Amino acid sequence: MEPFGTDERNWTHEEKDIITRFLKYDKHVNLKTAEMVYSAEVESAYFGKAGALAGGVISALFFNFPIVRNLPIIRRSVIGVLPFLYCYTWGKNTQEELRWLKTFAAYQRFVVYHGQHCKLWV
Amino acid sequence: GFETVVPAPPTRDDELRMIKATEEQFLQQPRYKLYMNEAHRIAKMNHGDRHNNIRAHFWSNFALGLLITGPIFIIPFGKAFRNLRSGVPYYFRPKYVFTQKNQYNQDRNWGAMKKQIPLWLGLSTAYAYWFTDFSINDDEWLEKGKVIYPHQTIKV
Amino acid sequence: MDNNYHFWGNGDRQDVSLSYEDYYSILDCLLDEKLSPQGLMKFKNLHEVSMYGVSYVPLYCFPVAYGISHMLTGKVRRGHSGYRNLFSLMSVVLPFTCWYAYTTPIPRRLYTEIICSNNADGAYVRNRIKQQKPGIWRKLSQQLYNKNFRFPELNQDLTATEFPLDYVAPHKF
Amino acid sequence: SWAYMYPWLKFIFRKYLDVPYYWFYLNGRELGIRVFFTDLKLFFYGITNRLFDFNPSSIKFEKYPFYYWINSSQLTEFNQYRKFVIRDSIIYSLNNYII
Amino acid sequence: MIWKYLQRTNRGNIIQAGLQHRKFENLPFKQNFDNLTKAYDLRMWYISNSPHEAKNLEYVNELEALHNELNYQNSRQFLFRTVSFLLGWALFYQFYELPKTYDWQDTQEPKHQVPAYGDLEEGGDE
Amino acid sequence: VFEFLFYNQQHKTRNGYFINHDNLMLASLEERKKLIFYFIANQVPEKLDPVDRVKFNEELSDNLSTKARLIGSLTGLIGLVGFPYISTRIYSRPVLNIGLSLLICPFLYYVGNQLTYSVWEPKFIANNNTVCELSKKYNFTVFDFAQAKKEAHLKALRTELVSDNLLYSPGI
Amino acid sequence: YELFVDHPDLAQWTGTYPKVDSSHGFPFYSTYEMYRDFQENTLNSDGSFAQWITL
Amino acid sequence: AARVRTLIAAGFSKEEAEQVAWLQNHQVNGKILGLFTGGFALYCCNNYFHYFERYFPRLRYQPFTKFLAQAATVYFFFKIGDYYFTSRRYGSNDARMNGLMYSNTYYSTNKEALIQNFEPLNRKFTEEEVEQFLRNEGRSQEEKRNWIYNPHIHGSTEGEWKADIHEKFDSGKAPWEREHVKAKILETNKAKIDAGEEIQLKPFKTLNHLDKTGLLHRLHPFIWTNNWTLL
Amino acid sequence: YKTHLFSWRWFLIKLLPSVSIILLGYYLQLTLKWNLFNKQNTIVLLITLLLLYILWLEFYQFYHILSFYGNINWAFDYDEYIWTLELDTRRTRLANNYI
Amino acid sequence: RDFEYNNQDVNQLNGAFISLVEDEKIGFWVGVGGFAYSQFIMRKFVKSTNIFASVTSLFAGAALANLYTHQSRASYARVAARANRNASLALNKLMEY
Amino acid sequence: EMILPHNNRQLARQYFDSLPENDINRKYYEGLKYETPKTFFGRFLNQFNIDAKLDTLSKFYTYQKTIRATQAELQEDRKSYLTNSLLFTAVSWFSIYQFARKGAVLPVLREYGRYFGTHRLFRQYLHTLVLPLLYTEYALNQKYYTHMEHLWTVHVNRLNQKILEDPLYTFYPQELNVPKHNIIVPTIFRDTPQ
């Protein structure tokens, strides 16, 4: 449905949210696509929270590491927060990637259910 | 879209006239160009003559470009191989065989030739492709495909 | 000013130029029933010319990558000995030069005839391009504005009554 | 590693494989070297234009919902895909939602 | 006239060229790859052109040493340049928005996705 | 190969003789009509009515025809400064002075006329309200323009052919 | 002869028999066994029947 | 001597441009031949111009006289050449002496025919003239297109269209010869008609007045150079 | 119309690690004649880490490739008001299977 | 209805005309600069007539402007020749009666 | 899009109804041909009316997709440019204060200015406060001025044509949407006699 091409603008975050919401409750979306979307939304939540918790855990140990023990407060805080940010970003990116990929797959399936793709003839 | 007036079935006289025209057209062909005698024989002969003229022009242009582009470009290009990039005279850097070039300027001559000969050939080919008109046989709309019979070719 | 001015694939300096990749992209938003015989012939000639040009395309970039790989190698020429490193560097560099070339517009008389055609075939082509390919259509319209080619579907039209469908870039009126 | 490019390799080779004999008189056009040289010159001209001439603008809208989702209309001639009516209706409904 | 411009050839076109003294007159006081290449080239030219033998052998030994030194310098230069190239590639791929706007049409095959010959391939009719 | 000297040359580089279908193939409909009207007026007044012909002749005289002559005359008069160029107390070279003046002044006249035409003709053709009104009244077509070009070529040929025997033309 | 003097291996790959004149009485600096299969499996050699059938 | 393309660049068919180029070639080649012959004279008569240094004492004392005399000799040679080629020199239009340039009969006949029978259009083509010309695209082939009469498209009567179409295209009558077209043209340029200037209906065909071969002017071809017999 | 041409715009970014490893290997091969055994350990460690990352990526790719050959999906039977996961074969391109 | 020039020829002519106009402006500027530089250089070392120096400067400026504008002008001339020949032939075919 | 004229509520015309008698749009309704400044310096003066023109168009085209997208994009771009300028200004001020606290002062301007004799620090602070806003204004001015010149030309062309309806790409709110009749009884089956 959306434009395809290198020059075309990439799908936005708000657009992706709107598309996911439409696919979640549309009366013109098949039950298989709905179940796929629900399963995608359910399981993708654990990854981000788990990554954030892993960052919180690992960053605490890195705050009391051998060389981290006797550094100035600013450098110690920065070094400690460094692992937490990396792991939180990893978890959130993984969750968003899984959700958006499955959403795009569901969108393709719905377009197929309505034949909304050019040169797609059965 | 406008259609012409359809002629009626020709009589034996018109048939004989067409046969005579076809016979003359067939007898006119020299044996030096072996082209099959079919519906598209006439168009094939025409396209072949056009391509032959174009090829003669292209070969003449290639000769002219080889004669001209050399002394202007290749010969000065030789001055580029007179000395090495380091400023010293060109030294023979063997790749696999340590060939013994005992002649005076054998190394420089061989290197310059192996470099310039492809350069001269390519420059001549480019000049020929640039300064030769292929529009004589070129058909933007492919209009040359009309079939012409020997009967329509000549009138007796 | 080559003598082969009547060549079907020949081109001028300031004619309509489109990026090679765009060409392939442009081939993704048309229907054969929408074209008349003239448009079909133009499209077939363009397809043949594009096949030959795309075949010859990376070869034109071949010297650039080989020189860059040698340039990226350093100040030593180990011909047929450093061949492995030179070949890996070329296999890396050539994709970049190829992308840069395929992203560069190239003027073509056939491209100008297919796009800027006063016929209904050209009208339909322009409309479908403006509809399905937003970025390509915007780039084509921007290029055409500097070429003083004014089509009704152009977004940078000063004689229009309906709001333009896309943002207009800074252009001298 | 570079094994996934089978479709990329298939394109040029299949395009070159489709040509019938020139002497068979189907198209009668043989412009290989001509294409190479003319395309070299044209690409040189195109690169020169892309370097030191007016460059087409790439700035575009980036904050509107489905701004690129254009429906058929009089400005589009309605000559779109025969089944694109469903897409147009969905686009209109989404525009109503986002309005 | 034309012969006087075409038949005769330039002296440098025929004579065996010498060394560009200007390229070897003033040099910076640094052991650069340029100086190393200059030494290697001088050794190679002397070896290929000298009629004597003892100085040739001494220059051959010095050329082996210079080859080792130039190999070291080239290794350092190659390391630096390759590191720079890899960092540039990584940075360019990091900041360039990868276009995820390709057509999904090749990603699906409906007749293949759901068998059109559904059970039609499973046993004939009569 | 010196046909530029032994033939007529002032008839082609003035009065819109350069206008060809190529120009008509490049301009819009109104501009095509204006250019066709200007070409018809300059080349073949016979197809135009007498009143419009008189008006166009007056306008052309007021704009370029007399103005180009005035500019050429001014240039030639400027070139005619110091007519006694080679003059001495013992003798004055009359033939030399007259020849130098005749060679210099005509070249200056030609330069001035050409400059005036090339400078003013674009404005006069483009921005003459009378010319626009005449173009609206006439509306010459492409076939009319082609006929006008053919007739202009024929008249140019006739001009050279008519004055073929200016010294002794018994006619037999 | 120049090729065989320069890169004898290539000469072997070319099947060129040793062209050095060994009449001097001293054995050559580099002898080799010829591989005349290219010179044999041809329509103008012992492989005439094989080459003809192949053609 | 005017190039075939430049005369074809100006509005003209293949034949008319050839004939006009033939006439221009005659004039220009006569002038060029005269000028070149004058050039060959001076290259050898340089001593002769200084040989007559006793019959005219001023030439040796005033060098400008020598240059003026050389220019005058060149002009005389050019005039002799013009009389040889561009003059009338009326002669018999027989088969024995035609072609050979003892007389300029061919050039004189072509010039007189061009000067006499050539006239401007002196009018604007009527709306029917353009429409008929617009309908005259491709219909000039040897096999005439079988024009069909459609009641809902051509209208009127089938015979009426058949007669009208026959007159327009099949009968070969040009729009310059149509009765209603002539009436409208008389009405259109009536003001010019009020001026008393005749309005030509058919444009002057240069092919109907010029002929390098001279077959139009009925000149007997040279016996030794032509198989065909004139008159 | 099923060209299945994968865009090269991601291929270079995906493949860069192998090129980096090759370049590091070449540097090590040039450095061994002038370096020490302890001095060159860092190159070996980095090469091993890169190879490990490549191996992990290849393992994930192999798992994904082997997975598509077996299509296991859940379908909802509303008769019993449940959703059960079944497995079935698939029909795809023979070219895809060969790849 | 009126005679319609060929669309391909029209586009080629339009491109040639645009290039010719741009090259004409550029060549005017180049020729002015060349005339100025020629006058300066002649005043630098040449000891001759002022009229001679001015004529040389004008000729050099005209030559420089032509060399800057020769390519575009020649291309436009060739395009115009081809288009005019085609149009004249077509019109003569249509206007024959 | 294509709004049905029967369902097309002429709300824009209503907006024209409430327009007073002194509006240039009325002159546009009378035929005021609007010409963009073809004189460079004049265009500079025209570079400041973009916001007012956008407000007028928003009053005219509250439902137009193109107008709404242009408004939203302009607001977002202005917010982003202002945020970048504010960040640059704050960073420059903090850096200047800290470097001067250690003596490091860039003498880009004169150390002591003419007339007022203000310190180089004060002059640099003023320049840092001033410049980024001007740069953002210039860039957004080029962009939005070209876009708004095109949009206002379109609006003037529409008004001079006395077209009192909304553009074809106008998405009216849900309150202006006629709901679709759902129940559609199909025709009963009947055998064709032939």
PDB file of C-alpha atoms in Angstrom, chain E residues 19-61:
ATOM      1  CA  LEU E  19      67.948  10.609 -14.394  1.00  0.00           C
ATOM      2  CA  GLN E  20      65.826  13.662 -13.564  1.00  0.00           C
ATOM      3  CA  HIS E  21      68.425  15.573 -11.556  1.00  0.00           C
ATOM      4  CA  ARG E  22      65.814  18.047 -10.294  1.00  0.00           C
ATOM      5  CA  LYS E  23      63.914  15.145  -8.710  1.00  0.00           C
ATOM      6  CA  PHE E  24      67.109  14.164  -6.850  1.00  0.00           C
ATOM      7  CA  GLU E  25      68.575  17.582  -5.967  1.00  0.00           C
ATOM      8  CA  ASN E  26      66.683  18.803  -2.872  1.00  0.00           C
ATOM      9  CA  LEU E  27      65.262  16.290  -0.401  1.00  0.00           C
ATOM     10  CA  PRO E  28      63.578  16.574   3.013  1.00  0.00           C
ATOM     11  CA  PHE E  29      65.506  15.357   6.059  1.00  0.00           C
ATOM     12  CA  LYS E  30      63.137  12.486   6.827  1.00  0.00           C
ATOM     13  CA  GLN E  31      63.429   8.739   6.259  1.00  0.00           C
ATOM     14  CA  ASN E  32      60.218   8.667   4.234  1.00  0.00           C
ATOM     15  CA  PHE E  33      58.993   5.973   1.857  1.00  0.00           C
ATOM     16  CA  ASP E  34      59.907   8.481  -0.853  1.00  0.00           C
ATOM     17  CA  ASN E  35      63.571   8.411   0.182  1.00  0.00           C
ATOM     18  CA  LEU E  36      63.419   4.619   0.503  1.00  0.00           C
ATOM     19  CA  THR E  37      61.983   4.309  -3.012  1.00  0.00           C
ATOM     20  CA  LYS E  38      64.650   6.700  -4.299  1.00  0.00           C
ATOM     21  CA  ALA E  39      67.385   4.532  -2.787  1.00  0.00           C
ATOM     22  CA  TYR E  40      65.813   1.333  -4.140  1.00  0.00           C
ATOM     23  CA  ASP E  41      65.437   2.826  -7.621  1.00  0.00           C
ATOM     24  CA  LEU E  42      69.021   4.112  -7.636  1.00  0.00           C
ATOM     25  CA  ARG E  43      70.247   0.654  -6.616  1.00  0.00           C
ATOM     26  CA  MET E  44      68.125  -1.064  -9.279  1.00  0.00           C
ATOM     27  CA  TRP E  45      69.307   1.301 -12.023  1.00  0.00           C
ATOM     28  CA  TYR E  46      72.950   0.888 -10.998  1.00  0.00           C
ATOM     29  CA  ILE E  47      72.597  -2.902 -10.929  1.00  0.00           C
ATOM     30  CA  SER E  48      70.926  -3.004 -14.342  1.00  0.00           C
ATOM     31  CA  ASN E  49      73.368  -0.512 -15.887  1.00  0.00           C
ATOM     32  CA  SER E  50      76.719  -0.853 -14.162  1.00  0.00           C
ATOM     33  CA  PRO E  51      79.514  -2.693 -15.983  1.00  0.00           C
ATOM     34  CA  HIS E  52      81.485  -3.167 -12.745  1.00  0.00           C
ATOM     35  CA  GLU E  53      80.783  -5.991 -10.288  1.00  0.00           C
ATOM     36  CA  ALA E  54      81.994  -5.175  -6.761  1.00  0.00           C
ATOM     37  CA  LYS E  55      79.908  -2.020  -6.360  1.00  0.00           C
ATOM     38  CA  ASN E  56      77.052  -4.015  -7.885  1.00  0.00           C
ATOM     39  CA  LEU E  57      77.318  -6.678  -5.169  1.00  0.00           C
ATOM     40  CA  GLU E  58      77.548  -4.066  -2.407  1.00  0.00           C
ATOM     41  CA  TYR E  59      74.487  -2.303  -3.822  1.00  0.00           C
ATOM     42  CA  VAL E  60      72.702  -5.672  -4.004  1.00  0.00           C
ATOM     43  CA  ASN E  61      73.240  -6.219  -0.280  1.00  0.00           C
TER      44      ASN E  61
END
